[model samples]
Target: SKTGGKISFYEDRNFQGRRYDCDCDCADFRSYLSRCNSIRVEGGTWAVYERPNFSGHMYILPQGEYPEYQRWMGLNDRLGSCRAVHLSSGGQAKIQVFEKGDFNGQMYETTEDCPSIMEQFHLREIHSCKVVEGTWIFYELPNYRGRQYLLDKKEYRKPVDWGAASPAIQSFRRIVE
Candidate 1:
C-alpha cells in the first residue's frame, strides 16, 4: 500500500534486458533504455512521454504490467520521460469541474465514478476543477479512454494549469485504492 510511487522501465519485452527504477520524473532515459519495450508499475498512475522532459506523445499508465509498448497503447516504442501523478494528500474522494475559471460558472460535481460526463450532463469541456478529496483521472474523451489528467485534492484554476493541452474533458473516475 505504501508503494504508490514505484515504477520500472525495461528495454525489452516482458521486462527483459536492462531495468531502471523510478520514483519521480526522469528527464531522459536514453542512458538506461534503448527503447521502452516493457514496463512494470508497482503503484500510482503515471504520465509517460515519448520525448525527454515530459514532452511528445503522452500515455497514462495505472499500476500494471505492460509487456509491450503496444499493450499500453503507446504511439511509439520509445520512452524518454515519466512522472508520478499527484493524488489528493487528504483521504477524501470528491471533485467538481467548472466551466469557467476561479471555480465559477456551470459546474458538475461527483462522488461516484462517472464513466461518461457527456452522456450524464451533455457537457464536453472542463475549464477548472476542485478536488475536495481523494484522486481522480479525467479523460479527454468519453468511456475512460484517450489522454488523461490525474487530479488530487487541490484546486485547478484553469485547464492549462492542470497540464491539459485543452479543456476537452469528457469523462472521469475515482482512483480506487
Candidate 2:
C-alpha cells in the first residue's frame, strides 16, 4: 500500500458509460476536467471595460471569451474605437483613437482630452517612442489578452512613454464581418 501512485476507488471496478463515482466532490464532468487545466495563469491578462482612474489606481480587466466585453463596446460605439496596453509596472491601461504613423525621430508629445492624470505620471526619455512599427505581441485566442506593446529593454528608458506621446497608432480592432 506504500506505492508512489495512489489507487483510484473505481480502478478495480469497470465504470465507464454510466455516471461514475466522482469522490472528488465535483458537480459534473466539466468541473473535474478543469482541475488539471495546463493554461498559464501568471502571464494571462484581461481587458477592463471602464476608464481607469489614473490617480494612484489600478484596474482588473475582463477575462475569458465572454460576451460582456463585446456588449460593453456595443453599448458605446465610440468605446469600440478604444485600445488597451500594459504598463511596465502592472496595470490595465487603455487609449482611444490610437493613430499609427511615423514620428520622424522627433521628440513629440501627445495630448489627451482628460488632463487630470498629471504630467509627471506620463513622461519619456527614449527617442525610440517614434512610431508604431515592427511586430506586436499577443496572447492566445479566445482571450487575446497580453502585453501588446513593448520597447527593446536596452533601448527602453524611464520615465517611459504612456503612449500618450507615441506617434499616431494603428487601430486595434475592426468588425469581424
Candidate 3:
C-alpha cells in the first residue's frame, strides 16, 4: 500500500517553540510558521526546500524524526516550502540509470531519490535511464541541487535526448502526484 503523508515543523530545535502541521504541497511556509528548525515526518517520503516555490536547496526526508535542521543537511533554520514525494500507484516505484548511452553499461536501480549518484553507484556519468514505474527528476549535482531534468514513466535511450546537456547526472528523486 502507498504511505500517507504528514509533516510537522518546529521553530526551535528538538521540536520546540511554535509549530505547524502539513500534509500537502506548501508553496510557502512563512505564513504558517516563523521558521523551520526541526521537523517530524509522519509518513511517506517528503522534500523540503530552503526557498519558496520548491526552489533552492532540497532535503529529502523519509518517515522519521529530525530534531534539527542540520540533521537533514539544511543550510539554515529557514524552510521556505515542502511537499510529499509522489509514488506510482500499486505501490511499485522504481527507476534505472545507465552509465553508457543507449541504455547500456553499468546500471543502477532504485526506488528512492538518490542524493548522490556517484556515491551510490560509484559511477560518474549517467548516459541513459528508464523510468519503470514513477515520475522522477534528475539533477546535475549531488544533494538534489544543480540543473534539473524531468523524466516520466518511459524509456530514455540517450541522456541528451532527455534534455541532459551532458551525461553528468548526480542525483534524482521521485515526483509525487
Candidate 4:
C-alpha cells in the first residue's frame, strides 16, 4: 500500500474481525464483512457506489480512519463499485458549478476551496456540476459546513443526481488527504 490506495473493511471495530482488504478499484465488492463497523483508508482517495457495479450513489473516503459508518456519513446500502483517485498528474481538485440544472445557466469553476460561492460569484445555487478533475466535497451552506456530497471525476447533471434536496450548495472544496 505504498503508492496505491488501500481500504480495509471489517465486521467489527479495530479490524481483523472478519476483514477484507480492498487494495485497489473493482466493479463490485462481491462480498461484504457481515457487518462493517470500521475501515482504515490509506494510499489516497477512494470511493464506493451504492448499488452493484457502480450505480447511482457514491461515498468518498480519503486517507483516514473510520471506526463507525457515521464517521464516513455513509449508509450500509451494500457498496458496489470502488475506485482510487490519484494526485492529479500534478493533480489539483477542479469542478465546474452551474446555476441551473442540465448545465443551462451561469457557470463557475474552482481548483481550490471556495468558502463563499455566493459572496464571490453571486451564485448561491449549484443545480448541477461538472467534476473535471480530482475529488470534491459540496456543502449545503457557506463556510464549507452543511449537508455534504462527494464527487470524483464525473458530471452531476442535476441536484437530484447529487442527492441534494435542492440547489443549496454554498461552498465546496477538494478532498486532499
Candidate 5:
C-alpha cells in the first residue's frame, strides 16, 4: 500500500497564509502555492525541492511540526515541489560517494551519518554517488547546513543526476530511521 502522511503548505509564517495539503509527490507547486513559508507533516517524512519537477536544492522534513521554512533550515521560501520519504522495512542505510565524475577517483562508503564529508573522506567535493539502502540527505555545507539534496536507493553518475548544478556536497545523513 502506498501510504504515508499529509503535508500542509503555508504561504505565511507560522502556517498563517493560504494552505494546501498534499499526500503524494507533487511536480509543481507553482500552481497551488505561490510560496511556501511554512510546512507541517502529519505523519511520514518528506523531501521538498526548491524548484519545479524536483529539480533543485532539496530539504528533508520528518513527521511533525514546522512553523516556518527557517525551522526546516531552508535557505529561502521558494519551494516548488515535494515527495514522500518512504522508509523501507528493515535495513541499514548504505551509500557510496565518489570524488570524481562517473564513480571515479576515491570512493567512500558509509552506513552512518557524516557531519562533514570533508573531514571524514578528506574530499572537497562529491561528483557521484549510489544509495544502496534506505534514504539519505546531502548538505552543501558542513554540520548539515546549506543546500540539501535527497537520494534514495539509486545510482547517480554525476552531480546533475541528483538534481545538483554542482558537485559541492560536504555533509550527509540517513533519513530512513
Candidate 6:
C-alpha cells in the first residue's frame, strides 16, 4: 500500500518467493527514509532509526555493541521501564540516564562488528530506547502537524513519516504534561 514510495530494511522475510505482509505495507517507511540518520565511519556506512514515540536516542553503529550507557539517556528497556523520563511542551523529550552516576554524553556510538551476525541483532540494535510518553507527537508532527495522543492507531493511516492524522485531528499527539 506504499503508493507513496518503497522502504528498505537490512533483512526482510518472505514466503514462497513472494513478499511478506510486513513488506507489503511498511507504513513507517516514508517518515522513516525522510528523517533517517546515517554516518560514514572508518570502513562502511550505517543507517540509524529514530522513534518519535520512544524516549531515547539511538546509534545503530555499522556493526558493533551499544556505545555503553550514559547520563540523560532516553532509551527505555524491554521491561517497559528503566529510568525516569519526561516530555516538555516545547517538543522536547528527556530521560534520566542513571539514578547515580553522570555520564559525559547524551548519545552513544559503538565500533567493531561482524557482517554475519549483523542481521540478527547488531544491525539496528546498536542503540535503542523507549519513547517517553507524548513524544510520539514528533511522528505526528511533520505530517498531522497538530495531532494529540491516544487516538486509534488506524486513524494514523499514512506512512509513519509526515502527514496523516485522525480522530478529529490534534488528538493523536500531545506534549508531556
Candidate 4 lDDT by residue in tens digits, 66-140? 876778777673566677765543467678888888987888877888898889898857787899777677877
**Strongest candidate by lDDT:** 5
Please rank every candidate by TM-score, starting with the best. Answer: 1, 5, 3, 4, 2, 6
lDDT of each: 0.81, 0.24, 0.81, 0.74, 0.86, 0.25
Q: Tell me the tens digit of each residue's lDDT in model 2 across 1-177.
A: 422211111111122222222221112233223121111112223222222222111223322222222332322211101112332332222222212222223343332222211232332222233222222221111123322233222222222353333332221221110
Candidate 6 structure quality by residue, lDDT tens digits, 1-177 = 433212223111111121211122232433333321111122222222244332223222222222222211213211111111233345443321111112222332222212222332322211122234233332222343322232111222133222322212211223334
- Measured on C-alpha atoms, candidate 5 has an lDDT of 0.86
Q: Tell me the spans in candidate 6 whose CA falls farther than 4 Å from its real position.
A: 1-11, 14-43, 52-57, 63-177
C-alpha displacement of 145 in model 6, angstroms? 36
lDDT of 3 by residue, 31-145 (tens): 8887788889888878888889988777678788999987877789878888777666656568988888898887878888799877888898888888878678888879978
TM-score against native, each model: 0.81, 0.19, 0.65, 0.64, 0.78, 0.16
**Candidate 5 local lDDT, 27-128, one digit each (tens):** 998988999888899988888988998877777788888898889888899988898878774668798988889999989888999998878878898888
List residue ranges in candidate 3 displaced over 4 A.
Answer: 1-3, 89-124, 134-152, 156-166, 170-177
The Cα RMSD of model 5 versus the native structure comes to 2.9
Q: Each model's number of backbone clashes?
A: 4, 7, 1, 1, 0, 20
TM-score, candidate 2, is: 0.19
TM-score leader: 1
Query: Comparing 2 and 6 by TM-score, which wins?
Result: 2
Off by over 4 Å in 5: 1-3, 11-14, 30-36, 55-57, 74-78
